[PDB]
Amino acid sequence: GYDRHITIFSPEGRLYQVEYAFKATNQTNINSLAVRGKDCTVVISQKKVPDKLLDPTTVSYIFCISRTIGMVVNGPIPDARNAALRAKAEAAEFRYKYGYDMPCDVLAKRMANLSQIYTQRAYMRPLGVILTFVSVDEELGPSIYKTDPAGYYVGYKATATGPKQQEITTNLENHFKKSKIDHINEESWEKVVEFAITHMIDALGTEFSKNDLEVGVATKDKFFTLSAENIEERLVAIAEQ
Amino acid sequence: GYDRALSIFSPDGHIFQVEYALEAVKRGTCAVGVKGKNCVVLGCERRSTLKLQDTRITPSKVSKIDSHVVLSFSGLNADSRILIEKARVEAQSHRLTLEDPVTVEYLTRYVAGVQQRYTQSGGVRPFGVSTLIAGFDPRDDEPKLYQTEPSGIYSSWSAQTIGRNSKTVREFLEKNYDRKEPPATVEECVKLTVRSLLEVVQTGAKNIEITVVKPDSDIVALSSEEINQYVTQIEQEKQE
């Protein structure tokens, strides 16, 4: 049964190493969520600092790839950082060669094509991560694009990733079934973050403090992550209505 | 590159890939070499499972390496072409740098060296081929007959056979070949070579090929009718 050790076809037509890379995705036991506003794209993720000896400022699964692009990872941190460094390098090289900032969807495709190679070439293992890229693209507007160990990638109106992704996904599905639009009809990003946090609370059934969350916001011409105090302001507003 | 060590030692001190190459030689059609006093004759079996063959264009079993040296073989046919090509190139390269054609011993030593190299190089299997190399050295009237084999060992033979049922024809030659007085003429040498093949071949003259090599680059391949005359004369004497 060496068809389960390397990336070759089993008799069923399956790549077991790709399937087991997908299982490594949930090893962190973290849930992420991404939604789009009018002018923005918000990505939130659970932050779990189990050890008191850890410096909580360094515990992050959100990455600033370029000025415009942000990336959240569901999976182990070494593979997440492998993917982050490569995406940064690709985004920089793209700008140098072609004279404009790499679009979110194009980076997602590029990383997906790299992931595909690991599923076809035997000496390379797949990375055990799901990469969710976010930006406010200058042509396409607010954008969410997600890549996985299979090399699959697709755009999203909103998305969720993690152990409890199905609960978050159905929660979001139901909201957009009501509103009948592809986005959160909201002017300020601050309120889109409040929406994201609120709908994760409802879906997961857990309350959050400022140190339980990690938030990334993409606007036109910059992507930035919120501090604990910025999140606290968000949590205060949610509680007050 | 593919670097994998295919020829390796086993616990009993055997290199199985080299020994399994000898089994490919055992499967090959019989080939025999008999040296007379002023000639060498290379006899070869042609298996009669293959009729409807075109004998004009089919690869002949005996190959000229230079105008004065020949090479027959037993084993994998495709493998033999690689050795023959390298040997032919080396024969011209020797003429080019030494201003003298190869000796039969030198050409043998080269071919044997190539065979050896494939038994301890990564990524390659041994040649499934044993050769009989025969001829005359330049400006020399002493006949030469050598044998190589997959391991890369080589040696000189008064007469020798290789291939399938080579045990039987070596038995024949061991009793019928006298060293003190070898086949004095071309006729006697060819006759002894045909006789020895007739122990194994079990058919008339289409299955036997004979090539006579004489001093000073005088190589000639016998036709079916010329060989068929020897086959007729042997069996008529045998009926007694």
Partner: protein, 243 residues
């Protein structure tokens, strides 16, 4: 089964068993710790005295990278040396191009990406070391700990090796009892104590304490070994606390 025989193979769990086996080599090694203080970091290590024939203060385990980063590790000592040699090349090439000495978070990822790269192929073995390292840069003090998987995080206190649970418990007290922070000279003393307390797990053989430190006030932000009187003051403090 057979998923643990080759590096870079995902088991059906989603685990790389060869990396988890490298962790067992780390857990088997001697205790080593790191303490982040106000304006720097302190590193310390348990050195088991196998025999009386070992020369004291000679078999140095803590290694310096550039002039400002200290590295200490537990597990297969040569693997640690290999990783530091790489770190030195990374720190050198960074300084060559960008002039400034390598920042500690930047340096941490350079080791991190390299260690992670040894979990991507079956033709290499994972590192058999958890590495505690850090120093002072332009953004202040930083302490890191880096595992066989390539995983690393920033720490207030860090500990690895056979006496890690013992050490971790002691570090967790210091974090609770000093929220405003610990001084560099305090951290040296506490480091000595923690290695002494963590020696109960390796209690058969006696040991040799080795401490180093980077501190903006005490060492001008450079890595230095704690030597002579300051080392003996810390050994005395540690010997007093166990009794």
């Amino acid at each position: 089964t057979g998923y643990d025989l080759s590096n870079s193979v995902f088991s059906p769990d989603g685990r790389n068993f060869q990396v988890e086996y490298a962790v067992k080599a780390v857990e088997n090694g001697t205790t080593s710790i790191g303490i982040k203080c106000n304006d720097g970091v302190v590193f310390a290590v348990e050195k088991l005295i196998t025999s009386k024939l070992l020369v004291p203060q000679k078999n140095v385990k803590i290694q310096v990278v550039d002039r400002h980063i200290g590295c200490v590790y537990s597990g297969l000592i040569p693997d640690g040396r290999h990783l530091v040699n790489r770190g030195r090349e990374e720190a050198a090439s960074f300084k060559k191009l960008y002039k400034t000495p390598i920042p500690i978070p930047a340096f941490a990822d350079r080791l991190g990406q390299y260690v992670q790269a040894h979990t991507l192929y079956n033709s290499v073995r994972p590192f058999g070391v958890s590495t505690i390292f850090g120093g002072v840069d332009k953004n202040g003090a930083h302490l890191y700990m880096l595992e066989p998987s390539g995983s690393y995080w920033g720490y207030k206190g860090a500990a690895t090796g056979k006496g890690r649970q013992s050490a971790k418990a002691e570090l967790e007290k210091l974090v609770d009892h000093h929220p405003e922070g610990l001084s560099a000279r305090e951290a040296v003393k506490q480091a000595a104590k923690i290695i002494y307390l963590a020696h109960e797990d390796n209690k058969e053989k006696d040991f040799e304490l080795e401490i180093s430190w980077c501190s903006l006030s005490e060492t001008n932000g450079l890595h230095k070994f704690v030597k002579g009187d300051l080392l003996q003051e810390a050994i005395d403090f540690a010997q007093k606390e166990i009794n």
